[PDB]
Amino acid sequence: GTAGKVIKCKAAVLWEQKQPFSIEEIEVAPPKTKEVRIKILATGICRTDDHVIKGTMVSKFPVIVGHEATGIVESIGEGVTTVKPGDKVIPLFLPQCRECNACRNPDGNLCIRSDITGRGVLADGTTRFTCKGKPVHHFMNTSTFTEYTVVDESSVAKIDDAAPPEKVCLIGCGFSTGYGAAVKTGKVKPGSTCVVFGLGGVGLSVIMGCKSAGASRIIGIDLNKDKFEKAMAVGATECISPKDSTKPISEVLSEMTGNNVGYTFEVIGHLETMIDALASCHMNYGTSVVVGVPPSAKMLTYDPMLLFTGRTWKGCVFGGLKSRDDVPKLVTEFLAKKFDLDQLITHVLPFKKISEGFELLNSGQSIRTVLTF
Amino acid sequence: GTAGKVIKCKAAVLWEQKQPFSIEEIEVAPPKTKEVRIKILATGICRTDDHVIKGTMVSKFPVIVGHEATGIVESIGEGVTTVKPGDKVIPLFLPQCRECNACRNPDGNLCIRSDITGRGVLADGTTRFTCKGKPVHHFMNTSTFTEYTVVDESSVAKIDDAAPPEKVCLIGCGFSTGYGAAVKTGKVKPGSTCVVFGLGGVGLSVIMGCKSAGASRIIGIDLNKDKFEKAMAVGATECISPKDSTKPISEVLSEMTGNNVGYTFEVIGHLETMIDALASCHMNYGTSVVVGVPPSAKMLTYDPMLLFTGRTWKGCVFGGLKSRDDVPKLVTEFLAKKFDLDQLITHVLPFKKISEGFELLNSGQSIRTVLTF
Amino acid sequence: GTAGKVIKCKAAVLWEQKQPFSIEEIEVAPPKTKEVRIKILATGICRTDDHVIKGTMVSKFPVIVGHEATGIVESIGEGVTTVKPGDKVIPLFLPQCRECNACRNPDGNLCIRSDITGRGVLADGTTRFTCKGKPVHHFMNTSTFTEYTVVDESSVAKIDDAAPPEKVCLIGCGFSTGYGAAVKTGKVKPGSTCVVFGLGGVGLSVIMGCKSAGASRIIGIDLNKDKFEKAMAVGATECISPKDSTKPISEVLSEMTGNNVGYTFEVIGHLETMIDALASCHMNYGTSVVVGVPPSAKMLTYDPMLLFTGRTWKGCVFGGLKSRDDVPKLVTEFLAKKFDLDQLITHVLPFKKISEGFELLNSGQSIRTVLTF
Amino acid sequence: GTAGKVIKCKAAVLWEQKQPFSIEEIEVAPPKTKEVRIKILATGICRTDDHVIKGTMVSKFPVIVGHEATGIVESIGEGVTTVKPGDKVIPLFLPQCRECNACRNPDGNLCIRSDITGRGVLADGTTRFTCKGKPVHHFMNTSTFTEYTVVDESSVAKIDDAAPPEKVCLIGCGFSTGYGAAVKTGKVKPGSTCVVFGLGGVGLSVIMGCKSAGASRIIGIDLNKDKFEKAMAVGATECISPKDSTKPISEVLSEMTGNNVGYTFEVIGHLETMIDALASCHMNYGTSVVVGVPPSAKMLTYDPMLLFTGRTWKGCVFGGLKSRDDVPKLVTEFLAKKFDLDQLITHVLPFKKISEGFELLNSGQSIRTVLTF
Ligand SMILES: NC(=O)c1ccc[n+]([C@@H]2O[C@H](COP(=O)([O-])OP(=O)(O)OC[C@H]3O[C@@H](n4cnc5c(N)ncnc54)[C@H](O)[C@@H]3O)[C@@H](O)[C@H]2O)c1
Ligand SMILES: NC(=O)c1ccc[n+]([C@@H]2O[C@H](COP(=O)([O-])OP(=O)(O)OC[C@H]3O[C@@H](n4cnc5c(N)ncnc54)[C@H](O)[C@@H]3O)[C@@H](O)[C@H]2O)c1
Ligand SMILES: NC(=O)c1ccc[n+]([C@@H]2O[C@H](COP(=O)([O-])OP(=O)(O)OC[C@H]3O[C@@H](n4cnc5c(N)ncnc54)[C@H](O)[C@@H]3O)[C@@H](O)[C@H]2O)c1
Ligand SMILES: NC(=O)c1ccc[n+]([C@@H]2O[C@H](COP(=O)([O-])OP(=O)(O)OC[C@H]3O[C@@H](n4cnc5c(N)ncnc54)[C@H](O)[C@@H]3O)[C@@H](O)[C@H]2O)c1
Ligand SMILES: C[As](C)(=O)[O-]
Ligand SMILES: C[As](C)(=O)[O-]
Ligand SMILES: C[As](C)(=O)[O-]
Ligand SMILES: C[As](C)(=O)[O-]
Ligand SMILES: C[As](C)(=O)[O-]
Ligand SMILES: [Zn+2]
Ligand SMILES: [Zn+2]
Ligand SMILES: [Zn+2]
Ligand SMILES: [Zn+2]
Ligand SMILES: [Zn+2]
Ligand SMILES: [Zn+2]
Ligand SMILES: [Zn+2]
Ligand SMILES: [Zn+2]
Ligand SMILES: [Zn+2]
Ligand SMILES: [Zn+2]
Ligand SMILES: [Zn+2]
Ligand SMILES: [Zn+2]
Ligand SMILES: [Zn+2]
Ligand SMILES: [Zn+2]
Ligand SMILES: [Zn+2]
Ligand SMILES: [Zn+2]
Ligand SMILES: [Zn+2]
Ligand SMILES: [Zn+2]
Ligand SMILES: [Zn+2]
């Protein structure tokens, strides 16, 4: 009965920077050509969502953040072919137009439609959200902290009907990012020695990926020792903290492996720890993968000799996945009991408790928090 | 015979930094255990040698430089098994002891015996040169600006007897580095687009590597437009200079290619161009290889965001070659007519005209000058 | 912690003879009085371990083989006084209780505690391993193809901490055996002419021993001519194959040396070659050392006149070394670069690739393959 | 004079095997170049001579046996420089030409001129004896069961004129063999425990040798207990017989010494007891010397594991003595009263009674029986 009509629903709106959410009553426009309106079933709280709140990430306001989620297709726009009302799907912050260079290349995944600049809009350059007359912006081609959202078709992944929305939502960000980091970006090898900087939802996902890649050793690092128990239990053959010693973490790690660190992953978001992760992989054959999003407008300064000796330094976006291709496959892999997401979800709460949720994340008391509708 | 005795010969000595070469009469101690004394037949003037003079490369003094050469074995020390007197060889600055992690690693090449710290001695920590009752240091496990030198066996490659020493000496640094940079370090896929920053002896070699890789486009970049004719002769599809436009080189290249720069190579040695090279490759699926040697003790400041999107940034030592295995294979490939080295040799002069060789190097009027004995 | 507790870990188990390994999850009991639980860091693949598989060496089943290794002391049992947790150690397949006759005799080394009969248990007659509720047998007082093992204190050699595990593990069997076979058992004298039958890990170590002793001539013998290059490199003066001539190898050797073969060494494990080795040393003043292990339950038949004329024929266990006395000394000698172990190691692979190590051995492609944990 | 003329005398000839002696009239040709004709004063009856009669030793017929003797030089052939007519000498069945590997090598003694193949001729391939027209063959470079014999100068030891020929004749075989077996071949050590298999003439000499080495225990073994009284008188500390118990002799011996049998000597001539002798010495640090002579054309089958554990097994020819150097010295030591030979001679008879001497040998009634002229 709503298809074609504006949908009045609620949404955690953010009117300005460094402000708390405001659960407003908003109006969601119907989907235009090649767009899709989705009803969010569950959505997790990712650390990147907090970046906007903190103001460590450029964004227009007002805006509805949230990007990690599972939903149902309420209605499809004109010309859509990959989905139909009733289909279970997962909104993709990383699209796959399949037409641009990065999409045409098997070794690329950052679609030209990727909202990196903080555009806060869809393909045609407009918004679909209105609240109190004034228009509300989108977040990374998704916007999930709402009962309903509209994303372009190029940002819709049709998944298996039987998939549990409250768990598979991690495939929309957190999990796929860390797992694919190892498996598809760093391409960790069997017998390797990996080092993961940061033991959050993504960090812990990298571990699973490395352990699954065959790494005979996986060392976890975190200032928060409370994250160790989770680490060891996930695949960390050990875990330490930078504060445990005064000698550079790079030296410590070398000594621990006898200078044979094949991979280092930065999954925090600190420039200082990016240098640390680089310096910690082997000087000639080590690879350092940066997964953590660095704070906007900050220049990095390091010793270029660290790179000259042969080191490989690369970035990662959504764990190197080709969204529309890989997401539905990973879902089937979860159904086939291959991976246990449950280890990652430390809290399931009703959407209304969103404020409490963000509190948890920021206190170091939680991995993932899944909000329910 | 000369075997077992100290050899008196002439060598181009550098008594201190920022001073011309002094062609002194020196004493070359005989080869100890697993060492090899070599008679130099032909040696190339490489830019890195100039770094010692200019003072931008750490080195002890006095010292004898030169590291690109072809020689003949005069006498082997005790225990030597890979070479015998009269054998044609190429001394190696990048050793291959076959037993350290890097040598054992199929993805490594920086042997632990590499003199990266400017020690200026052999494996046992001593020198073999003397001049006026003063010990003269070695340079990067080689020292070829001399009638005779002594290296460790791990630093000797036995090559085909019929190899013209005045041509294949480039296989000791110049040509191997460039060619390998493209084929081994960068793994240039066929049909891709490559951009090379710097059209000197190594830069031109990189063009040959990309050309051997099947690249559909290879764009040369140099401030000296006189280098352009050569670049085109060895395989460049077109050449340009940064001064030709006011907009950033990264944007000029993106526009020229439709946002498709597969691989960039920094073949100059300026941190400035290292960032330009990084920034000039596709933001998500591009690879930038640092071939140029950055000036001593200089930190590099760049925008981390260039990396995070997915760019791969990696160093390169000797073209990623495992010295003792690859050098012989390259000489065989030269004799098998797989490539031309004549194009890179602009001048062939007697060893005594070494200062002119350096003049032509610095005045930009020479790719490779080869000094003969 | 793990002290006093059962350890769950992985181990390559053999359930019956003529079967491939089965990496299984096993439990390792804590150490009882005067025993020591050790974590394995690196372990070699010695041909003896292959005899168990092939069934040419008696063993009870199931069993965990492997015996050439380096480790770190996880925990010590009651009354232990020679090692402490943290200590680096080499487990000893040849004990040294220091109380028995062979231990008190300066010319003996086969301690009563040696497991030569396939006992597969510790000094108190019991096992320390369980897998699927059923007890698993030890191998030659060691058992190292497991993450953890328990040995009697009489079978632990505390070594230098700075010792690289993946190198000094050969001092646990292979190197010490062939080396001591020349220096300690055969007592090769300066100027002699030695002959080695078999050029694998042990054979190559014999040649190093002969050279170290002062042999003027070392002849290598092997069907696999691909082994010649390394035999020559390590010390040989020439190598040949039994197939090169139709006349008995003894005659050939007589002819090459003009009937002056002082020492022959059988480092293979064939009754046939044991005889060949005997008949090849001088008929009156020759010495023939048997290093290779004869297939179990096979009687030897030879011409006694070979012996009567004066030939000395003697067996050899662990190169004649007194375990806890000579092992620690060899590690220290190694650290002083007295001998090269890396020449013997042709492959380093992660433990999980155990079959490939064995396949490489059996296909004639490796000397020593070292497995890392 | 007789010098230069054929000498007619008597000799004990064997026309064929398994037939008693025949005292015939024979012709002894004059000594050719580098040969010596000797008058036999006294000669012992060695068990080896009986081997020829029994047919368990290869020989041509007819032949004149006997090899243990003392004599006087009748005439010297052309070129002879070491002895003159009238000199007292001992014919050597083991030559010392001083120009062959064994001879020149300090550890060898089996000269190249030794008659091991059972030729029965002198260096030049001819005989010197004639009887009833037909030529009679020599035995082991000696032939002493005759009044006159001719030997090569390499088989002649000039000894002290004051030496009792009826006692020192044992130094031509029996005594020197047994004595040297312990002192020179086995190299028995002070305080060791030796076991001698066979209490005959050579066995008793081994005991004497072991007693001079400082042995602490010397256990004698024989099936004939009447030999025990003499064994104890020459040095044995106890004696036993294989039939004294049912358990294997090796266990009996082990039990008696607490598994500490340093040396075993076989001085009987059986393959079975040679095996018993090996198995009887300490499995790791024991040495078993084979002195007895094994019946020709018989293969020995034993368990190689007996040898593998470390036992040293060696043969013995004439107690390992360099005949021309050692025989004189031994006589000199006898005259210096180092040992008593009288204990070994149980019967002194005239040469015509040779048959009785042999009867007493094969009945067990005598140790050595000396025949006089
Ligand atoms: N690249 C992308 O595709 C992508 C995807 C998802 C998330 N992210 C980014 O990855 C990073 C983490 O994601 P998350 O959900 O796992 O965050 P998270 O907050 O749950 O985990 C952060 C971890 O870093 C640890 N940490 C902080 N400072 C530390 C330090 N100095 N040294 C060691 N550990 C320290 C914290 O204790 C915590 O364990 C953030 O920058 C996020 O924006 C990026
Ligand atoms: N990685 C190694 O293994 C290795 C091996 C060989 C040489 N090198 C280094 O590689 C670099 C080049 O070697 P080369 O012998 O070919 O030097 P070269 O002097 O012949 O070439 C340098 C080129 O760079 C050009 N150039 C300089 N500044 C420029 C700028 N700002 N922009 C564009 N072009 C500019 C010059 O005109 C010249 O053509 C040096 O740093 C040398 O030390 C490294
Ligand atoms: N005595 C002990 O203390 C002790 C110690 C270690 C090893 N071993 C024994 O030593 C022997 C060899 O061990 P390894 O570790 O050196 O093994 P290995 O397999 O690496 O070497 C065997 C070598 O002998 C060669 N060979 C095989 N058949 C041949 C033949 N018919 N004639 C000539 N050469 C032939 C093989 O090609 C190979 O080169 C084995 O029996 C092993 O059990 C004994
Ligand atoms: N190697 C040489 O240089 C050399 C020198 C002299 C003698 N021999 C040989 O040495 C051996 C001994 O010579 P001998 O002159 O002293 O002989 P012998 O006949 O006097 O003594 C043999 C002894 O062995 C004992 N015996 C035989 N079978 C027995 C058995 N099964 N178990 C235990 N005892 C048994 C006999 O009772 C006798 O006491 C002979 O074979 C002889 O040919 C060798
Ligand atoms: C069960 As069964 C034949 O291995 O004893
Ligand atoms: C010795 As079984 C466990 O194979 O019967
Ligand atoms: C034949 As079985 C040792 O497995 O019982
Ligand atoms: C008798 As014993 C324990 O030394 O072999
Ligand atoms: C004659 As005695 C050495 O046995 O006492
Ligand atoms: Zn996210
Ligand atoms: Zn796209
Ligand atoms: Zn932090
Ligand atoms: Zn190396
Ligand atoms: Zn100096
Ligand atoms: Zn160079
Ligand atoms: Zn420049
Ligand atoms: Zn010119
Ligand atoms: Zn079974
Ligand atoms: Zn072994
Ligand atoms: Zn059992
Ligand atoms: Zn012992
Ligand atoms: Zn074989
Ligand atoms: Zn080495
Ligand atoms: Zn001789
Ligand atoms: Zn004849
Ligand atoms: Zn005799
Ligand atoms: Zn008998
Ligand atoms: Zn009688």
Curated annotation (Swiss-Prot), chains A, B, C, D:
CDD domains: alcohol_DH_class_I_II_IV
UniProt tissue specificity: Preferentially expressed in stomach.
Pfam families linked: ADH_N, ADH_zinc_N
One of the record's GO molecular function terms: zinc ion binding
Residues the record lists as binding NAD(+): 47-51, 198-203, 222, 227, 268-270, 291-293, 316-318, 368
Transmembrane segments: none
E.C. designation(s): 1.1.1.105, 1.1.1.1, 1.1.1.66
GO biological process, one term: retinoid metabolic process
Activity regulation, short description: Retinol oxidation is inhibited by the detergent Tween 80. Ethanol inhibits both all-trans-retinol and 9-cis-retinol oxidation. 13-cis-retinol is an effective competitive inhibitor of the 9-cis-retinol oxidation. All-trans-retinoic acid is a powerful inhibitor of all-trans-retinol oxidation. 13-cis-retinoic acid is a powerful inhibitor of all-trans-retinol oxidation. Cimetidine competitively inhibited ethanol oxidation.
Enzyme class: oxidoreductase
InterPro entries referenced in this protein's UniProt entry, alphabetically: ADH-like_C, ADH-like_N, ADH_Zn_CS, GroES-like_sf, NAD(P)-bd_dom_sf
Known function: Catalyzes the NAD-dependent oxidation of all-trans-retinol, alcohol, and omega-hydroxy fatty acids and their derivatives. Oxidizes preferentially all trans-retinol, all-trans-4-hydroxyretinol, 9-cis-retinol, 2-hexenol, and long chain omega-hydroxy fatty acids such as juniperic acid. In vitro can also catalyze the NADH-dependent reduction of all-trans-retinal and aldehydes and their derivatives. Reduces preferentially all trans-retinal, all-trans-4-oxoretinal and hexanal. Catalyzes in the oxidative direction with higher efficiency.
Official protein name in the record: All-trans-retinol dehydrogenase [NAD(+)] ADH7
Species this protein is from: Homo sapiens
